[PDB]
C-alpha cells in the first residue's frame, strides 16, 4: 500500500520541513508508506497556490498538507471544499465551518479574553498584525463592547521595513496620550522581535509596564532581552517542555546536524514545527485506522484536471474527513481530538509569565474549564 499525499511548504520554512522529515522518519509503519510530493512555492501569491494545488491534484493524492496565508485562506477552503479533498494545516484558524479543512493550531481568542478577565483590565492597547485575519480583533472588540473596556487597537503590519524607526517612535508617542501602561502584541515570530527591539531602544520595558505576547510560541522569540528589564510579560505556550515525550523529542532534536537539517540545532522548537510533527502522526494514525477497518480506497494517478466542469467528487474521500475527525492522540500540543467541523477540542494552553530566572507556568487553560 502506497499512499500519495501533497505538500505546500513556503519558501523559507526550514525548521518546519526539518520537523516534517523527523516526523516522516519517526512515524513509519508496516501497513503502508507515505509518499509526499513537496512543493516549495510562495504562500501569498494565490496563482502559485492554485498551480501547486492543481499539480498535487494531477498526481492523484488523498490529502494535502501545507500552510496558508491570510490572503489565500479562501482559495484553499474553496478548492478543498469543491473537490472534497482533506487539507491538514498548522496555520491560523478560519472564521466559519469549512469542510475538509483539518487545522492544527488551537484557538487563541478565548484564552486571551480569559487572561484579560483574570488580570482585571479596563484600558489597554492592542498592537496587532493583519497576516492571520482579523478574528481576534473582532473578538476583543465584541467583548469590549459588552464589558466596557477602553481598547486602543492599532495595526502595525502596514509599515514598511525601510522606514520603521520614526513610525514606531510616533506610534509609542501617540500611545502616551492616554498614558497607556498595558499593551497586547499580536504578531508572528518575526514582528514580535522587531517590536521588542524597538521598545528596548526607546526604553519602555522598566517596571510599571505590562506586555502580553499573543501567540502560541511564547518562547520562540528572544526573551533574554526583556528578562532583566522589570516589565513583567505574560503569554501563551502550547509546547510544555516539562513533559516526558517533549523532553524525549528535544533530546533527539538538539543533537541533529545543522547541515543535514536546517534550523534544528536549538534547545527549543517553534510551534509550527511541533504542529507539523503532530500532524504527521495524525495522518499516519488515520491511514492506520483505514488499514485496520479494511476499507479499500485505492486508485491511481488519473484524477484528471482540477478545473473539470462539472467537477464531480469521489465519495471515498468523504470518509477520509470522517477518518480525520476520529483521530484522538497525544502529541507535542497535548491531547489531539477534533469536532465535526475540523477544529481542535479538549486541549491545554499554558499561561506563561516571565520571571527573573526565566519563564514560569502559572496555570493552564482549556475550553471545558
Amino acid at each position: 500500500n502506497s499512499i500519495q499525499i501533497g505538500g505546500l511548504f513556503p519558501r523559507g520554512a526550514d525548521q518546519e520541513y526539518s520537523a516534517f522529515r523527523v516526523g516522516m522518519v519517526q512515524f513509519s509503519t508496516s501497513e503502508f508508506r507515505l509518499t509526499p510530493h513537496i512543493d516549495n512555492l510562495e504562500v501569498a501569491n494565490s496563482f502559485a497556490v492554485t498551480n501547486a494545488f492543481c499539480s498535487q491534484f494531477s498526481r492523484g493524492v488523498y490529502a494535502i498538507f501545507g500552510f496558508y496565508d491570510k490572503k489565500s485562506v479562501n482559495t484553499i477552503t474553496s478548492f478543498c471544499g469543491t473537490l472534497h479533498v482533506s487539507f491538514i494545516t498548522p496555520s491560523f484558524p478560519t472564521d466559519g465551518t469549512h469542510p475538509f479543512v483539518i487545522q492544527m493550531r488551537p484557538d487563541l481568542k478565548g484564552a486571551l479574553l480569559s487572561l484579560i478577565e483574570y488580570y482585571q483590565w479596563d484600558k489597554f492597547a492592542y498592537l496587532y498584525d493583519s497576516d492571520r485575519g482579523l478574528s481576534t480583533l473582532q473578538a476583543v472588540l465584541d467583548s469590549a463592547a459588552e464589558k466596557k473596556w477602553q481598547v486602543t487597537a492599532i495595526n502595525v503590519g502596514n509599515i514598511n521595513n525601510d522606514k520603521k524607526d520614526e513610525t514606531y517612535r510616533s506610534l509609542f508617542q501617540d500611545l502616551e496620550l492616554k498614558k497607556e501602561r498595558r499593551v497586547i502584541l499580536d504578531c508572528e515570530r518575526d514582528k514580535v522581535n522587531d517590536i521588542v527591539d524597538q521598545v528596548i531602544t526607546i526604553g519602555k520595558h522598566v517596571k510599571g509596564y505590562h506586555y502580553i505576547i499573543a501567540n502560541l510560541g511564547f518562547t520562540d522569540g528572544d526573551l533574554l532581552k526583556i528578562q532583566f528589564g522589570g516589565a513583567n510579560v505574560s503569554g501563551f505556550q502550547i509546547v510544555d517542555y516539562d513533559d516526558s515525550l517533549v523532553s524525549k523529542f528535544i533530546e533527539r532534536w538538539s543533537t541533529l546536524e545543522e547541515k543535514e537539517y536546517p534550523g534544528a540545532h536549538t534547545a527549543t522548537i517553534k510551534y509550527t514545527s511541533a504542529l507539523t510533527y503532530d500532524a504527521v502522526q495524525v495522518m499516519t494514525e488515520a491511514f492506520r485506522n483505514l488499514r485496520k477497518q479494511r476499507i479499500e480506497i485505492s486508485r491511481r494517478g488519473n484524477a484528471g484536471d482540477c478545473l473539470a466542469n462539472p467537477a464531480v467528487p469521489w465519495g471515498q474521500g468523504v470518509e477520509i474527513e470522517r477518518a480525520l475527525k476520529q483521530v484522538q492522540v497525544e502529541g507535542l500540543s497535548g491531547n489531539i481530538k477534533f469536532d465535526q467541523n475540523g477544529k481542535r477540542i479538549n486541549y491545554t494552553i499554558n499561561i506563561m509569565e516571565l520571571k527573573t530566572n526565566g519563564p514560569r507556568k502559572i496555570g493552564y487553560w482549556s475550553e471545558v474549564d
Partner: antibody, heavy 119, light 108 residues
C-alpha cells in the same frame, strides 16, 4: 563520515539459522530506520526487510516468516536473523539506513558479507 | 510488483565524456527514484536523490533527469573515481525493487 559493514558466518548448513551483525558508524540509530537487503550473484538486488526507528518492523512478501530484525543502539549494530536457508542462499547481504528527503531514500549502506549455504 | 530494468549492461566511456545511464520502470514512479554508486570494493554511496537533486557530499559533475517511467543520470566529465557501478532504486511501493545496474568501462 557514515560507514557500515556486515559480518556473518560465511558458510552455514542447509535449513539452519543465519545471524548477520551489521556495524554502522558516523550516525545514531535511535532516530533513523534500518533496512536489510540481499544481493544474489547475477540476479537483481532484492529488499529483505526493514525496522523503524520507533520499533515497528516489516519484511518482504516472499519470506516474511523467515526473516527477523533486532537492534542494539548502544553499539549501533543490527542483528538480522534468517532461518530455513536453502541451497540458493549463497549470496551477499547488506544493511542500510533510511531517510526522508521528499522520497524514502537509502542514505548510507554497507559493504555486505557473503554467505554460502552448503552442507 | 513494480519491476525496474536497465537496457545497458556495460557502457564504455573515456575521461571527460558526458555519460548517460538510462533506467525504466514498470509503471509511473512519480520521480521517486534514487541513483547510487557502488565501487568494486563493495562500498555503496548514494549519488542523486529524488531523480533531480544532488545530495550533500557528491560532486557537481553529475546530474539527473527524467519523467514518467524513464529516468536518466548524466555525468558531464568522468574521473578516475567515477569508475563504478550505477544503480537505480525506486521507493514508491513496498517491497522496493532496485535496478539491475550498469558497469562503466574505460575506453582504450
Amino acid at each position: 563520515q557514515a560507514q557500515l559493514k556486515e559480518s556473518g558466518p560465511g558458510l552455514v548448513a542447509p535449513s539452519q539459522s543465519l545471524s548477520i551483525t551489521c556495524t554502522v558508524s558516523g550516525f545514531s540509530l535511535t532516530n533513523y530506520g534500518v533496512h536489510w537487503v540481499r544481493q544474489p550473484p547475477g540476479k537483481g538486488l532484492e529488499w529483505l526487510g526493514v525496522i523503524w526507528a520507533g520499533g515497528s518492523t516489516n519484511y518482504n512478501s516472499a519470506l516474511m516468516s523467515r526473516v527477523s530484525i533486532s537492534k542494539d543502539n548502544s553499539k549501533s549494530q543490527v542483528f538480522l536473523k534468517m532461518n530455513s536457508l536453502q541451497t540458493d542462499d549463497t549470496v551477499m547481504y547488506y544493511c542500510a539506513r533510511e531517510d526522508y528527503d521528499y522520497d524514502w531514500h537509502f542514505d548510507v549502506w554497507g559493504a555486505g558479507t557473503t554467505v554460502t549455504v552448503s552442507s | 510488483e513494480i519491476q525496474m530494468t536497465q537496457t545497458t549492461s556495460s557502457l564504455s566511456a573515456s575521461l571527460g565524456d558526458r555519460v548517460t545511464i538510462s533506467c525504466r520502470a514498470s509503471q509511473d514512479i512519480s520521480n521517486y527514484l534514487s541513483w547510487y554508486q557502488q565501487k568494486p570494493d563493495g562500498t555503496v554511496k548514494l549519488l542523486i536523490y529524488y531523480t533531480s537533486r544532488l545530495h550533500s557530499g557528491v560532486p557537481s559533475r553529475f546530474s539527473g533527469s527524467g519523467s514518467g517511467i524513464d529516468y536518466s543520470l548524466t555525468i558531464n566529465n568522468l574521473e578516475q573515481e567515477d569508475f563504478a557501478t550505477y544503480f537505480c532504486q525506486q521507493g514508491n511501493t513496498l517491497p522496493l525493487t532496485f535496478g539491475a545496474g550498469t558497469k562503466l568501462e574505460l575506453k582504450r
